[PDB]
Design an enzyme around this catalytic site. Structure first.
Site, PDB file in Angstrom:
ATOM      1  N   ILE A 187       9.497  -0.105  -1.969  1.00  0.00           N
ATOM      2  CA  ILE A 187       9.314  -0.816  -3.433  1.00  0.00           C
ATOM      3  C   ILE A 187       9.345   0.370  -4.233  1.00  0.00           C
ATOM      4  O   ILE A 187      10.629  -0.211  -5.693  1.00  0.00           O
ATOM      5  CB  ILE A 187       8.099  -0.754  -3.402  1.00  0.00           C
ATOM      6  CG1 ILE A 187       8.209  -3.472  -3.776  1.00  0.00           C
ATOM      7  CG2 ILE A 187       7.089  -0.992  -4.514  1.00  0.00           C
ATOM      8  CD1 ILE A 187       8.552  -3.729  -2.426  1.00  0.00           C
ATOM      9  N   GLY A 188       9.775   1.712  -3.728  1.00  0.00           N
ATOM     10  CA  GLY A 188       9.940   3.029  -4.598  1.00  0.00           C
ATOM     11  C   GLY A 188      10.545   4.428  -3.768  1.00  0.00           C
ATOM     12  O   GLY A 188       9.479   4.279  -2.835  1.00  0.00           O
ATOM     13  N   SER A 189      10.509   5.066  -4.144  1.00  0.00           N
ATOM     14  CA  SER A 189      10.579   6.284  -3.661  1.00  0.00           C
ATOM     15  C   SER A 189      11.455   7.212  -4.709  1.00  0.00           C
ATOM     16  O   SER A 189      11.822   6.896  -5.847  1.00  0.00           O
ATOM     17  CB  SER A 189      11.839   6.728  -2.747  1.00  0.00           C
ATOM     18  OG  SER A 189      12.935   6.923  -3.593  1.00  0.00           O
ATOM     19  N   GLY A 190      10.720   8.441  -4.368  1.00  0.00           N
ATOM     20  CA  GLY A 190      11.272   9.487  -4.869  1.00  0.00           C
ATOM     21  C   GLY A 190      10.446  10.676  -4.928  1.00  0.00           C
ATOM     22  O   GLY A 190      10.703  11.474  -3.566  1.00  0.00           O
ATOM     23  N   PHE A 219       8.190  12.935  -5.054  1.00  0.00           N
ATOM     24  CA  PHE A 219       6.386  13.105  -4.986  1.00  0.00           C
ATOM     25  C   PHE A 219       5.491  11.492  -4.167  1.00  0.00           C
ATOM     26  O   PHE A 219       4.506  11.134  -4.214  1.00  0.00           O
ATOM     27  CB  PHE A 219       5.272  13.416  -5.768  1.00  0.00           C
ATOM     28  N   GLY A 220       6.604  10.262  -2.663  1.00  0.00           N
ATOM     29  CA  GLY A 220       6.348   9.337  -2.314  1.00  0.00           C
ATOM     30  C   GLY A 220       7.376   8.326  -2.208  1.00  0.00           C
ATOM     31  O   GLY A 220       7.619   8.024  -3.056  1.00  0.00           O
ATOM     32  N   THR A 221       6.542   8.334  -1.295  1.00  0.00           N
ATOM     33  CA  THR A 221       7.297   6.664  -1.334  1.00  0.00           C
ATOM     34  C   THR A 221       6.455   4.922  -1.235  1.00  0.00           C
ATOM     35  O   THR A 221       5.748   5.453  -0.717  1.00  0.00           O
ATOM     36  CB  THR A 221       8.491   7.092   0.203  1.00  0.00           C
ATOM     37  OG1 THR A 221       8.996   7.655   0.262  1.00  0.00           O
ATOM     38  CG2 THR A 221       8.802   5.092   0.369  1.00  0.00           C
ATOM     39  N   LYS A 273       1.512   3.804  -0.726  1.00  0.00           N
ATOM     40  CA  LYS A 273       2.120   5.305  -1.053  1.00  0.00           C
ATOM     41  C   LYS A 273       2.176   6.339   0.255  1.00  0.00           C
ATOM     42  O   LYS A 273       1.008   6.673   0.286  1.00  0.00           O
ATOM     43  CB  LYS A 273       1.382   5.729  -2.638  1.00  0.00           C
ATOM     44  CG  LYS A 273       2.674   6.964  -2.302  1.00  0.00           C
ATOM     45  CD  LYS A 273       2.426   7.823  -3.905  1.00  0.00           C
ATOM     46  CE  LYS A 273       0.832   7.240  -4.795  1.00  0.00           C
ATOM     47  NZ  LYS A 273       1.362   8.763  -5.922  1.00  0.00           N
ATOM     48  N   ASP A 296      -0.487  10.136 -18.446  1.00  0.00           N
ATOM     49  CA  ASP A 296       1.088   9.710 -18.503  1.00  0.00           C
ATOM     50  C   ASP A 296       1.091   7.727 -18.723  1.00  0.00           C
ATOM     51  O   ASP A 296       1.309   7.146 -17.529  1.00  0.00           O
ATOM     52  CB  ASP A 296       1.751   9.788 -17.067  1.00  0.00           C
ATOM     53  CG  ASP A 296       2.896   9.455 -16.523  1.00  0.00           C
ATOM     54  OD1 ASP A 296       3.319   9.253 -17.983  1.00  0.00           O
ATOM     55  OD2 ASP A 296       3.905   9.863 -15.828  1.00  0.00           O
TER      56      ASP A 296
HETATM   57  C1  LIG Z   1       0.373   2.577  -3.553  1.00  0.00           C
HETATM   58  C2  LIG Z   1      -0.291   3.547  -5.119  1.00  0.00           C
HETATM   59  C3  LIG Z   1      -1.540   4.082  -4.196  1.00  0.00           C
HETATM   60  C4  LIG Z   1      -1.698   5.317  -5.403  1.00  0.00           C
HETATM   61  C5  LIG Z   1      -1.332   5.092  -6.590  1.00  0.00           C
HETATM   62  N1  LIG Z   1      -1.968   5.814  -7.484  1.00  0.00           N
HETATM   63  C6  LIG Z   1      -2.582   5.140  -8.743  1.00  0.00           C
HETATM   64  O1  LIG Z   1      -2.508   4.333  -9.183  1.00  0.00           O
HETATM   65  C7  LIG Z   1      -2.920   6.353  -9.153  1.00  0.00           C
HETATM   66  C8  LIG Z   1      -2.394   8.312  -9.760  1.00  0.00           C
HETATM   67  C9  LIG Z   1      -3.312   9.043 -10.233  1.00  0.00           C
HETATM   68  N2  LIG Z   1      -4.132   8.065 -11.863  1.00  0.00           N
HETATM   69  C10 LIG Z   1      -4.262   7.541 -11.667  1.00  0.00           C
HETATM   70  C11 LIG Z   1      -4.945   6.439 -13.088  1.00  0.00           C
HETATM   71  F1  LIG Z   1      -5.233   5.259 -13.061  1.00  0.00           F
HETATM   72  F2  LIG Z   1      -6.414   6.937 -12.860  1.00  0.00           F
HETATM   73  F3  LIG Z   1      -4.977   7.494 -13.692  1.00  0.00           F
HETATM   74  C12 LIG Z   1      -3.510   6.407 -10.489  1.00  0.00           C
HETATM   75  C13 LIG Z   1      -0.196   4.232  -6.945  1.00  0.00           C
HETATM   76  C14 LIG Z   1       0.422   3.184  -5.721  1.00  0.00           C
HETATM   77  C15 LIG Z   1       1.545   2.461  -6.381  1.00  0.00           C
HETATM   78  C16 LIG Z   1       2.523   2.595  -6.673  1.00  0.00           C
HETATM   79  C17 LIG Z   1       2.951   1.507  -7.491  1.00  0.00           C
HETATM   80  O2  LIG Z   1       4.542   2.136  -7.547  1.00  0.00           O
HETATM   81  C18 LIG Z   1       5.961   0.960  -6.697  1.00  0.00           C
HETATM   82  C19 LIG Z   1       7.555   1.877  -7.827  1.00  0.00           C
HETATM   83  O3  LIG Z   1       7.098   2.812  -9.331  1.00  0.00           O
HETATM   84  N3  LIG Z   1       3.902   0.938  -7.112  1.00  0.00           N
HETATM   85  C20 LIG Z   1       2.069  -0.041  -6.867  1.00  0.00           C
HETATM   86  N4  LIG Z   1       1.582  -1.259  -6.967  1.00  0.00           N
HETATM   87  C21 LIG Z   1       0.245  -1.699  -7.005  1.00  0.00           C
HETATM   88  C22 LIG Z   1       0.353  -2.993  -7.566  1.00  0.00           C
HETATM   89  O4  LIG Z   1       1.769  -3.552  -6.851  1.00  0.00           O
HETATM   90  C23 LIG Z   1       2.274  -3.329  -7.509  1.00  0.00           C
HETATM   91  C24 LIG Z   1       2.947  -1.903  -6.535  1.00  0.00           C
HETATM   92  C25 LIG Z   1       0.784   1.101  -6.175  1.00  0.00           C
END
Ligand SMILES: Cc1ccc(NC(=O)c2ccnc(C(F)(F)F)c2)cc1-c1cc(OCCO)nc(N2CCOCC2)c1
EC number: 2.7.11.1
Length: 268
Positions: free
Chosen positions: A15-18, A20-22, A35, A128
């Protein structure tokens, strides 16, 4: 504990990559988002940023915060969250240009302030906050997360990241002393209020990023609040101006912001 037993998570479409993670759409007790923080053996930095992100997420249990579900270390460092159908606020406002009614814009604002108030009460500074990190689950419920893969977890402003439009004058000045506070999150929320009420990103008539950085930081440039649509309540425009104050200590915190939006919403 939140450590998922080995060989349970399955990963599907990327769904995404960068840097600092995929992120993948995956399966673990239904649809999940996974992730993968590393690919090859992780560095001590990656392991630490993983431990810090998991440490932050495991403290969150709120409907306006992305649901953390668990983590894995075998075979890769993975963070599992709920999977959400819908799109981010950014996608809605700036890509597909969804025209939400004023009542819905105020509700998105309220739900964002609701999730932000929660994080701040748990001593979590987002660092952010922007419309891309406000997911609209089924295009109705705000789920705050950090969906970005260009940035690392912990520490505080090295820099090098385009979220500059949501950066407070003290954050955009790129000083050695940590510029991140609850008030810098409030400024970013004020920018989100601007996006909701104008339907636009600020400084759209300036094509130079270094000029935006220099000028916002020097207080020469600020969002044009006269661009807010006519049906935006006077209280909302007043709140937006309060959140965007150049002096950080003049900015209201989220219990006050939340009370202001809740009063605004009742009086429509
Ligand atoms: C999987 C994952 C793991 C950890 C995290 N970590 C945080 O959210 C985080 C980190 C630090 N602090 C906080 C704070 F909220 F406390 F600040 C929150 C994010 C994801 C993630 C990435 C992303 O990326 C899609 C590509 O851009 N899409 C999603 N979706 C979820 C909903 O369904 C659409 C896809 C989930």
């Amino acid at each position: 504990d939140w450590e998922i037993p080995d060989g349970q998570i399955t990963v599907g479409q990327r769904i995404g990559s960068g840097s600092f993670g995929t992120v993948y759409k995956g399966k673990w007790h239904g649809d999940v988002a996974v992730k993968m923080l590393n690919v090859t053996a992780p560095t001590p930095q990656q392991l630490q940023a993983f431990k810090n992100e998991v440490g932050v997420l495991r403290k969150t249990r709120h409907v306006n915060i992305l649901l953390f579900m668990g983590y894995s270390t075998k075979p890769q460092l993975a963070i599992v969250t709920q999977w959400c159908e819908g799109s981010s606020l950014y996608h809605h406002l700036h890509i597909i240009e969804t025209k939400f009614e004023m009542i819905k814009l105020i509700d998105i604002a309220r739900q964002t302030a609701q999730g932000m108030d929660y994080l701040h009460a748990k001593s979590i500074i987002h660092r952010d906050l922007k419309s891309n990190n406000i997911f609209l689950h089924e295009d109705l419920t705000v789920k705050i997360g950090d969906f970005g893969l260009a940035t690392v977890k912990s520490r505080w402003s090295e820099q090098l990241s385009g979220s500059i439009l949501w950066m407070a004058p003290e954050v955009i000045r790129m000083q050695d002393k940590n510029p991140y506070s609850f008030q810098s999150d409030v400024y970013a929320f004020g920018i989100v209020l601007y996006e909701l009420m104008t339907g636009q990103l600020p400084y759209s008539n300036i094509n130079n990023r270094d000029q935006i950085i220099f000028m916002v930081g020097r207080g020469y440039l600020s969002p044009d609040l006269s661009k807010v649509r006519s049906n935006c309540p006077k209280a909302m425009k007043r709140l937006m101006a309060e959140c965007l104050k150049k002096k950080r200590d003049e900015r209201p915190l989220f219990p006050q912001i939340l009370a202001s939006i809740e009063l605004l919403a009742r009086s429509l």
